[PDB]
């Protein structure tokens, strides 16, 4: 039913290497060229990729910033209330960033904020202008 294992033989293939005299030598040069083609294409992205490596010298260690550790509180100092309103205008609904900006309020205290002070801060409006960007 099937060849020896490892040997490759195929109706499509066999016809293509018999179709004429040097139809053998032909097909084995479109593959020797296909090979060199793809082989220097490697040294040339291997070359490009080397440049981009040089530009990342040092990574971002100098531009990094220390982590902030601060115990998450419950009351809303009027300071923190105002950081909130300005945060809702630059971050839309990304509560994660909004909690990160404040740094002391639960992503859910943030959600709670949205409904409690909803009236006295007009976030719908504020939010509607966040959408204007």
């Amino acid at each position: 039913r099937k060849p020896p294992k490892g040997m490759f033989l195929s109706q499509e293939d066999v016809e293509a290497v018999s179709a004429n005299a040097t139809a053998a030598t032909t097909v084995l040069r479109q593959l020797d060229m296909e090979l060199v083609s793809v082989k220097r294409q490697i040294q040339n992205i291997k070359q490009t990729n080397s440049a981009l490596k040089e530009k990342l010298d040092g990574g971002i260690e100098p531009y990094r910033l220390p982590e902030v550790i601060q115990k998450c509180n419950a009351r809303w100092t009027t300071e923190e209330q105002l950081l909130a309103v300005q945060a809702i205008r630059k971050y839309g609904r990304d509560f994660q960033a909004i909690s990160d900006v404040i740094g002391n309020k639960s992503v859910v205290q943030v959600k709670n904020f949205f409904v409690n002070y909803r009236r006295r801060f007009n976030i719908d409006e504020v939010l509607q202008e966040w959408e204007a960007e």
């Binding site: 040997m7 490759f8 033989l9 053998a24 097909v27 084995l28 593959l31 296909e34 090979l35 793809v38």
Partner: peptide
Amino acid sequence: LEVVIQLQEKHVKDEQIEHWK
């Protein structure tokens, strides 16, 4: 036997191409 040695030399190449590729 030639059409089998050729097709085995073809295969060795198709195998390098789709590796480097």
